[PDB]
Amino acid sequence: VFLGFLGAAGSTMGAASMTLTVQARNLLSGIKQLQARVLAVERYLRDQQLLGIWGCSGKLICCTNVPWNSSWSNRNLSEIWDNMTWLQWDKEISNYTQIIYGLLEESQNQQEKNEQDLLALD
Amino acid sequence: VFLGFLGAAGSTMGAASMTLTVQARNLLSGIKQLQARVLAVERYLRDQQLLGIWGCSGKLICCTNVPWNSSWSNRNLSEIWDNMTWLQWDKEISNYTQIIYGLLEESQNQQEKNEQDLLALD
Amino acid sequence: VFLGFLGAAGSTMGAASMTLTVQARNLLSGIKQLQARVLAVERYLRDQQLLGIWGCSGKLICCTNVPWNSSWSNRNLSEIWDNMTWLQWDKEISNYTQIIYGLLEESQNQQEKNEQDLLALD
Amino acid sequence: ENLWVTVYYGVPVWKEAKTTLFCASDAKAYETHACVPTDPNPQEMVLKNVTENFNMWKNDMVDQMHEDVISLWDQSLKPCVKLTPLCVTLNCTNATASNSSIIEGMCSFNITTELRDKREKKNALFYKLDIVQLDGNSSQYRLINCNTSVITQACPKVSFDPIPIHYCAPAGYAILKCNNKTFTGTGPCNNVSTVQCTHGIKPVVSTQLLLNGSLAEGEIIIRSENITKNVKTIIVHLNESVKIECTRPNNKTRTSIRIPGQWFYATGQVIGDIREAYCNINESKWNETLQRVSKKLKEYFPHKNITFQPSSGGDLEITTHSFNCGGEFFYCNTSSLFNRTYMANNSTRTITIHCRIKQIINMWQEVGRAMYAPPIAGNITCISNITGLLLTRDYGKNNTETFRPGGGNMKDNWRSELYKYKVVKIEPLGVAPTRCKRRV
Amino acid sequence: NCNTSVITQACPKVSFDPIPIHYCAPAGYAILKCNNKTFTGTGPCNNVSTV
Amino acid sequence: TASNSSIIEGMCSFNITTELRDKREKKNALFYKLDIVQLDGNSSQYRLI
Amino acid sequence: QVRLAQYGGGVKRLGATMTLSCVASGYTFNDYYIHWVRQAPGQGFELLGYIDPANGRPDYAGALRERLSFYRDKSMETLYMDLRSLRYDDTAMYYCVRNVGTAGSLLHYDHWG
Ligand SMILES: *[C@@H]1O[C@H](CO)[C@@H](O[C@@H]2O[C@H](CO)[C@@H](O[C@@H]3O[C@H](CO[C@H]4O[C@H](CO[C@H]5O[C@H](CO)[C@@H](O)[C@H](O)[C@@H]5O)[C@@H](O)[C@H](O)[C@@H]4O)[C@@H](O)[C@H](O[C@H]4O[C@H](CO)[C@@H](O)[C@H](O)[C@@H]4O)[C@@H]3O)[C@H](O)[C@H]2NC(C)=O)[C@H](O)[C@H]1NC(C)=O
Ligand SMILES: *[C@@H]1O[C@H](CO)[C@@H](O[C@@H]2O[C@H](CO)[C@@H](O[C@@H]3O[C@H](CO)[C@@H](O)[C@H](O[C@H]4O[C@H](CO)[C@@H](O)[C@H](O)[C@@H]4O)[C@@H]3O)[C@H](O)[C@H]2NC(C)=O)[C@H](O)[C@H]1NC(C)=O
Ligand SMILES: *[C@@H]1O[C@H](CO)[C@@H](O[C@@H]2O[C@H](CO)[C@@H](O)[C@H](O)[C@H]2NC(C)=O)[C@H](O)[C@H]1NC(C)=O
Ligand SMILES: *[C@@H]1O[C@H](CO)[C@@H](O)[C@H](O)[C@H]1NC(C)=O
Ligand SMILES: *[C@@H]1O[C@H](CO)[C@@H](O)[C@H](O)[C@H]1NC(C)=O
Ligand SMILES: *[C@@H]1O[C@H](CO)[C@@H](O)[C@H](O)[C@H]1NC(C)=O
C-alpha cells in the first residue's frame, strides 16, 4: 500500500521518527524487465543482514554500546535536532560512515563473547 | 524435507498450533521457468518483514498490545476454538484484516517511541 | 567489503569464534549469468529461516535447551577444542546432523507453547 | 472479555489462484527436456475431514500445459530442414507398382543439389492425399499446403513420443487431488488429498477417442458441462480397457535426396505386393462396452432411445480416428464401429477396419503451419489400450437422442486426464484473538 | 566445405583476440589456488590460498 | 495511365515468382517517384531506393 | 470492429442449387462457432444449422439434413452454404451469426451479419 511515502522529508529528526515505518514498508510488486525486482530483493537484504551484524535486529530504532567520538566532527546538534532537516546531516556524516560500522561490529562481538562466557559459567 | 505439509487441516486451532512449523518450513528448491522461484523468495519476505513491522519478530506465536474489538464481529469462539476448523474463520475475519494491521503498526510505534524515551532518561 | 574471508581456517574453534562475522558478511554483488545471484539469495535464506525455526534468531552464537547425547559419538574434545581444527569435526558430526534439527525444532515448540500458556494465565 | 489481538504463522488456509507450474523429466530420453528438469519421487498425504470444491472446466493448468506442448513441439522442430525448394511443378504418371490407385505418386521434378549450377531431375514416391491437382492437365500436381505455408521435415533421430511428465508445484503453492472415485467433474469432494507433484501424464495425440491413458475406479464415468444442455464435447471415461491392434503390413524403401548439409528423406519403393493397412478390434469387448456405456448414459436422459452414427463433414481428423504410431500417422475408418441403437424400455470374433496414411500433417490445433513426416521402413505393428471416448450430440427430436463421435480440439483430450488436480495458494498469516496482553 | 556446411565470412572490425579474462566466484563459493611450486597436477597441497 | 502522371510517376512492370517457383510472372503496380530511383542508361529503367 | 460480410443472393430460379458466402474480418477465426439463421416474411426466425470453423464439424436441423451443406476455407477465412433443390417457401432473409461459447458450452449470439 502506497500513502505518504517520503512525505515526511522537510521535517525534522524527531518528526520523521514516528513515520519511519511508511518508508520501511516499501518492498512492493521489452520483456526482460524482471531483473530489477531481484535488485529490490537484494539491497534490502544487504540492509537487513547488516543490522544483524550490529545487533540492532528487527526494531527500527535502537541504541548501541559504542560511544560518540568528536573525530566524526563535533556539531552540537541539540537545537539542530529539531531544524536540521535530513539531507545535510547525511552529507556531513558521510565522511565517517564507512568507519563506524567496524566499531559497531567489534562491540557486537564483545557483547556476544562476554555474554556467552558469562552463561558458560553454568 | 516434505512430510505432513498441510496435513493438520481439518483439525482445530490448538491442534494445528503445535504443527505450524511444518507449514513454516517450505521454501524448498520451455526453459524460462526460473521466475517462479523468485516469487517464492518475494512473498515470504513480504510476509516476514510484515511481522517485523508488528514487533512479532521471528517467533511463530506471540501476543500484542492491541485489544480486541467487537466491531470485527463478536463470535464467542471459546467452544468453537476446539471445533471451528480453520477456513471459515479466515472467511469470517477477512472483512477486517486490512484494518487491524494499522492498529498493530501504530501500537508498535507507541512501544518503540515510549521505550526509547524511557531509555533516553539515561 | 572483502578482507580475511575464510582466513581463520587452520585455527581452532575458539580462535575462529571471534572472526565468524567476516564469513557472515559475504552476500556481495554469454549474457544469462544473472541466475547464480538468485541462488545466493536463496541458500542464505534457507540458512537464516532455519535458525528461525530453532529459536537461535539473529545472533551468531547461542545455546539451546537440547542436551548432548553420546549417541552422536562421545569425543572428549575438551583439549581438542583448541587443536581440532574445523573440517574433521564436520566429517565426524555429519553422521547425525540430519537428526538433531528435529530435536531443536521440537524443543522450540516446547518453549513457545509453554511460554504462551504461562502468559495465557493472564 | 480481556481479549487482545494475536497473530499466527503457518496457518493452514488457502485461496484459489493462477500460477506458473513446474515440470519434471525422465532418466532415459531421446536426447530443453532431454536432461532437464529434475526427476523427483513424490509422496501423498490424505487431508482428513477436508471438503473442497473442484471443477475440471474452469481450471487453468490445462491451457498451461497445452502451451507447453506447443512450445516443446516448436523447439524440437526448429533445428530442422525447410522443404521450400520442393514446391516446384510435379509431373506424375504413377504406373510403377502392381497397383497404382492406392498411393498414386511414384512424380519427377527438378532440384538444385550441392553446386547451384542447374537443377537436376529426380523422382520419388508420394501419397495422393498429400498431392493436389493443378489446373489444366491432370498430370501436373503440387504439394498440398505449399499454397498456404512452409513445410518442415522432422529429423528422425529426435522423434518425440509420449514420455510421462510430472507437474511440480512451486513453493508456497499446493496441489489438491480429490481421490474420491465417483467424482463427476464438478462439485465438492470429501476425499481431499495433497501431493508435491502429479503422476506421469503422457502427451497423447488422438482423435474420436483416447488411448494409452488411465482408467476409472468404479464403473464408466461421464463428464460434461452443466450450464446448458447445448454442449460442445462430453467425455466418457472407461473402467475397463479394450485392446486395439494396428498394422501397416508393407515394407518401404527410404531414399535420401541431398539439398548444404541437409539431406531430404523420401520413399523409394514398396517391397513386395501391396496390402492395405488395417486395425483389429475384439468384437465382444467392443459391443459389450457399447451396451454398458449406453445403459449408463440413459441415467441422465430419462425416456429417450440411444442411437449412434459416425460423424459427417469436415476434414479427415474428425471423420476418422487419427493417431500416430511409430513414425507414421494413421487415419482409421470408424463407420462400422458406431452403428448401434438401443430402446429406452470373451474374445470371439474380430472387427477389421481399413485405414489410410499420409505424410504431411498440419499442427494438431492450427493451420498455417505443417510438418512432413519422414518415411518409415519395414512393416509396422502396434498394440494399444483405449481408455475413453469423446462424444458430441445431435439435436434429434421426441423419443430419440443421438450421439456421434467428435473431438477435433486437442485440449479436451488433456482435460480428460487433469480433472483430478487443482492449484491453491497458501495464506499462512491468519490473525486471532487471545486472552493475553503483551509485555510493557 | 560447401558439400558439408555453410561458410560465413568474419567481419574484420569485430575481430576477437586473446583478451585476458578473470573468472569471478559467485557469493557463497570460494576459489582455492594451491600456490605450491612443485604441484604435480594431483594430490594434496599444503600451500592453500584463496582469491 | 492517369490523367496526370508527373505527380506520382509509377503506374512499372516487373517479374515475380508466385506460388509455384516455376517461372516468374509479369505484374504491375503503382508507386511514388520519391521511392523510385533512376538506373543508368535508359531512363525507363528504375530501381527501388 | 468485427464484420461479417455476406455475398450471393438476389433472385434464384426454382429447383436449382444455390450458394451463399460469408467473410469474417477482425477476430481469431478458430475461436467462435458460426450459426446460420433465416427469416421468412410473416414468420419468426428459425435456425438451419451451425458450423465449427476449426475442424469443419457441422450440425443441421432435423427437417433439412438432406438439402443443406456447410463448409469453409480457413486460409481466406470464408464460409459457404450450399442449398440444393430450392422450393418456393425458401423466400427469406438469411444471416450468419457469430456465437459466443465457453470451453464446454455455447451461449448467446453477439453479432449479426
Ligand atoms: C491455393 O491455396 C488455397 C488455400 O489453401 C487452396 O484451397 C482452395 O481455395 C479455394 C478458395 O477458397 C477453394 O474454392 C472454394 O471451394 C468450395 C468447394 O469446392 C470444392 O470442395 C468440396 C469438398 O469440400 C467439402 O465437400 C462437401 C461439400 O462439397 C462437404 O460435405 C465436405 O465436408 C467438404 O467440406 C467439393 O465437394 C466441391 O464440390 C468442390 O469440388 C466452393 O464451394 C467455394 O465457393 C464457390 O461456390 C460456388 C461454386 O461451387 C459459387 O458460388 C462460387 O464460385 C464460390 O466461389 C470456393 O470455390 C478450394 O476448394 C480450396 N481447395 C481445397 C480446400 O482443397 C488452393 O487449392 C490452392 N491452389 C491450388 C492451385 O492448389
Ligand atoms: C501405447 O502403449 C503401447 C504399449 O507399450 C505402445 O506400443 C509400443 O510402442 C513402442 C514405441 O512406439 C514400440 O517400440 C518399438 O519397437 C520396435 C521393435 O522392438 C523398435 O524397432 C522401435 O525402435 C524404433 O526407434 C529406435 C530409436 O528411435 C530406432 O532406432 C528404430 O529403428 C525404430 O525406429 C521401437 O522401440 C513397441 O514395439 C510397441 N509395442 C509394445 C508391445 O511395446 C504404444 O506405442 C503406446 N502409444 C500409442 C500411441 O499407442
Ligand atoms: C456384438 O453385438 C452386435 C450387435 O448386437 C452383434 O451384431 C449382430 O450380429 C447378429 C448375428 O450375430 C446379426 O444378426 C445382427 O444383424 C448384428 N447387428 C449389427 C451388426 O448391428 C455382434 O454379432 C456381436 N458380436 C459378438 C462377438 O458378440
Ligand atoms: C464421492 O462423492 C459422492 C458425491 O455425493 C458421494 O456420494 C460418495 O459417497 C463419495 N465417495 C466416497 C467414497 O465417500
Ligand atoms: C448401419 O447399419 C444399417 C443396417 O441396415 C445400414 O443400412 C447403414 O448403412 C449402416 N450405416 C453405417 C454408417 O455403417
Ligand atoms: C609442494 O608439495 C610437495 C609434495 O610432496 C612437497 O614435497 C613440497 O615441499 C611442497 N612445497 C613446499 C614449498 O612446501
PDB file of C-alpha atoms in Angstrom, chain G residues 18-111:
ATOM      1  CA  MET G  18     -27.653 -22.047 -54.601  1.00  0.00           C
ATOM      2  CA  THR G  19     -24.562 -20.897 -52.709  1.00  0.00           C
ATOM      3  CA  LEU G  20     -24.051 -18.128 -50.161  1.00  0.00           C
ATOM      4  CA  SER G  21     -20.703 -16.887 -48.883  1.00  0.00           C
ATOM      5  CA  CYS G  22     -19.521 -15.042 -45.791  1.00  0.00           C
ATOM      6  CA  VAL G  23     -16.234 -13.379 -44.872  1.00  0.00           C
ATOM      7  CA  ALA G  24     -15.167 -12.678 -41.286  1.00  0.00           C
ATOM      8  CA  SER G  25     -12.637  -9.914 -40.735  1.00  0.00           C
ATOM      9  CA  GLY G  26     -11.458  -8.916 -37.291  1.00  0.00           C
ATOM     10  CA  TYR G  27     -11.154 -11.762 -34.785  1.00  0.00           C
ATOM     11  CA  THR G  28      -9.492 -15.118 -34.168  1.00  0.00           C
ATOM     12  CA  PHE G  29     -11.173 -17.317 -36.755  1.00  0.00           C
ATOM     13  CA  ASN G  30     -10.879 -20.636 -34.908  1.00  0.00           C
ATOM     14  CA  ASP G  31     -12.396 -19.500 -31.616  1.00  0.00           C
ATOM     15  CA  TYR G  32     -16.072 -18.850 -32.401  1.00  0.00           C
ATOM     16  CA  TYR G  33     -18.811 -21.047 -33.845  1.00  0.00           C
ATOM     17  CA  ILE G  34     -20.971 -19.787 -36.719  1.00  0.00           C
ATOM     18  CA  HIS G  35     -24.740 -20.267 -36.900  1.00  0.00           C
ATOM     19  CA  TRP G  36     -26.983 -19.733 -39.938  1.00  0.00           C
ATOM     20  CA  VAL G  37     -30.370 -18.157 -39.255  1.00  0.00           C
ATOM     21  CA  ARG G  38     -33.180 -17.178 -41.611  1.00  0.00           C
ATOM     22  CA  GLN G  39     -36.469 -15.276 -41.506  1.00  0.00           C
ATOM     23  CA  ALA G  40     -39.355 -15.870 -43.876  1.00  0.00           C
ATOM     24  CA  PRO G  41     -41.734 -12.901 -44.282  1.00  0.00           C
ATOM     25  CA  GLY G  42     -44.679 -13.105 -41.920  1.00  0.00           C
ATOM     26  CA  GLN G  43     -42.873 -15.700 -39.796  1.00  0.00           C
ATOM     27  CA  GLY G  44     -40.444 -15.750 -36.921  1.00  0.00           C
ATOM     28  CA  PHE G  45     -36.798 -16.678 -37.196  1.00  0.00           C
ATOM     29  CA  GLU G  46     -35.632 -20.285 -37.219  1.00  0.00           C
ATOM     30  CA  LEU G  47     -32.244 -21.981 -37.170  1.00  0.00           C
ATOM     31  CA  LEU G  48     -30.877 -24.023 -40.060  1.00  0.00           C
ATOM     32  CA  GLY G  49     -27.601 -25.204 -38.558  1.00  0.00           C
ATOM     33  CA  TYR G  50     -24.157 -24.346 -37.286  1.00  0.00           C
ATOM     34  CA  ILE G  51     -20.510 -24.932 -38.139  1.00  0.00           C
ATOM     35  CA  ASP G  52     -17.235 -25.128 -36.250  1.00  0.00           C
ATOM     36  CA  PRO G  53     -14.637 -23.366 -38.442  1.00  0.00           C
ATOM     37  CA  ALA G  54     -11.710 -25.045 -36.659  1.00  0.00           C
ATOM     38  CA  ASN G  55     -12.412 -28.646 -37.711  1.00  0.00           C
ATOM     39  CA  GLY G  56     -15.276 -28.207 -40.179  1.00  0.00           C
ATOM     40  CA  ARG G  57     -17.814 -30.004 -37.996  1.00  0.00           C
ATOM     41  CA  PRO G  58     -21.406 -29.182 -38.998  1.00  0.00           C
ATOM     42  CA  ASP G  59     -24.748 -29.795 -37.370  1.00  0.00           C
ATOM     43  CA  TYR G  60     -28.102 -29.435 -39.073  1.00  0.00           C
ATOM     44  CA  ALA G  61     -31.775 -29.062 -38.249  1.00  0.00           C
ATOM     45  CA  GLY G  62     -33.905 -32.191 -38.231  1.00  0.00           C
ATOM     46  CA  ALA G  63     -36.150 -31.325 -41.168  1.00  0.00           C
ATOM     47  CA  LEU G  64     -33.349 -30.191 -43.514  1.00  0.00           C
ATOM     48  CA  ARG G  65     -30.496 -32.709 -43.167  1.00  0.00           C
ATOM     49  CA  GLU G  66     -30.676 -33.748 -46.845  1.00  0.00           C
ATOM     50  CA  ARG G  67     -30.822 -30.358 -48.584  1.00  0.00           C
ATOM     51  CA  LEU G  68     -28.159 -28.325 -46.751  1.00  0.00           C
ATOM     52  CA  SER G  69     -24.364 -28.262 -46.797  1.00  0.00           C
ATOM     53  CA  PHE G  70     -21.867 -26.102 -44.930  1.00  0.00           C
ATOM     54  CA  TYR G  71     -18.136 -25.865 -45.415  1.00  0.00           C
ATOM     55  CA  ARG G  72     -15.338 -23.362 -45.000  1.00  0.00           C
ATOM     56  CA  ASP G  73     -11.882 -22.357 -46.173  1.00  0.00           C
ATOM     57  CA  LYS G  74      -9.517 -21.457 -43.354  1.00  0.00           C
ATOM     58  CA  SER G  75      -6.879 -19.540 -45.328  1.00  0.00           C
ATOM     59  CA  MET G  76      -9.289 -16.995 -46.824  1.00  0.00           C
ATOM     60  CA  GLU G  77     -11.438 -17.461 -43.624  1.00  0.00           C
ATOM     61  CA  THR G  78     -14.506 -17.820 -45.830  1.00  0.00           C
ATOM     62  CA  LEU G  79     -17.699 -19.767 -45.120  1.00  0.00           C
ATOM     63  CA  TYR G  80     -20.106 -21.254 -47.651  1.00  0.00           C
ATOM     64  CA  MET G  81     -23.676 -22.517 -47.728  1.00  0.00           C
ATOM     65  CA  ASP G  82     -24.836 -24.826 -50.468  1.00  0.00           C
ATOM     66  CA  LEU G  83     -28.590 -25.426 -50.596  1.00  0.00           C
ATOM     67  CA  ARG G  84     -29.920 -27.944 -53.107  1.00  0.00           C
ATOM     68  CA  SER G  85     -33.354 -28.123 -54.772  1.00  0.00           C
ATOM     69  CA  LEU G  86     -34.807 -24.702 -53.996  1.00  0.00           C
ATOM     70  CA  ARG G  87     -38.546 -24.547 -53.348  1.00  0.00           C
ATOM     71  CA  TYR G  88     -40.920 -21.593 -53.249  1.00  0.00           C
ATOM     72  CA  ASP G  89     -41.179 -21.429 -49.447  1.00  0.00           C
ATOM     73  CA  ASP G  90     -37.457 -20.671 -49.063  1.00  0.00           C
ATOM     74  CA  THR G  91     -38.019 -16.937 -49.738  1.00  0.00           C
ATOM     75  CA  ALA G  92     -36.201 -15.447 -46.774  1.00  0.00           C
ATOM     76  CA  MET G  93     -33.724 -13.007 -45.310  1.00  0.00           C
ATOM     77  CA  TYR G  94     -30.603 -15.013 -44.453  1.00  0.00           C
ATOM     78  CA  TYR G  95     -27.969 -14.108 -41.868  1.00  0.00           C
ATOM     79  CA  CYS G  96     -24.838 -15.600 -40.448  1.00  0.00           C
ATOM     80  CA  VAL G  97     -24.245 -15.020 -36.734  1.00  0.00           C
ATOM     81  CA  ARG G  98     -21.160 -15.428 -34.577  1.00  0.00           C
ATOM     82  CA  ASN G  99     -21.626 -17.461 -31.403  1.00  0.00           C
ATOM     83  CA  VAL G 100     -20.018 -16.884 -28.014  1.00  0.00           C
ATOM     84  CA  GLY G 101     -19.186 -20.067 -26.142  1.00  0.00           C
ATOM     85  CA  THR G 102     -17.277 -21.360 -23.151  1.00  0.00           C
ATOM     86  CA  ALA G 103     -14.797 -24.236 -23.095  1.00  0.00           C
ATOM     87  CA  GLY G 104     -17.667 -26.714 -22.849  1.00  0.00           C
ATOM     88  CA  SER G 105     -20.917 -24.953 -23.734  1.00  0.00           C
ATOM     89  CA  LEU G 106     -22.391 -22.443 -26.167  1.00  0.00           C
ATOM     90  CA  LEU G 107     -24.198 -19.234 -25.239  1.00  0.00           C
ATOM     91  CA  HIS G 108     -25.903 -16.154 -26.722  1.00  0.00           C
ATOM     92  CA  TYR G 109     -25.140 -14.619 -30.128  1.00  0.00           C
ATOM     93  CA  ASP G 110     -23.237 -11.325 -30.279  1.00  0.00           C
ATOM     94  CA  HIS G 111     -23.059 -10.040 -33.870  1.00  0.00           C
TER      95      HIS G 111
END
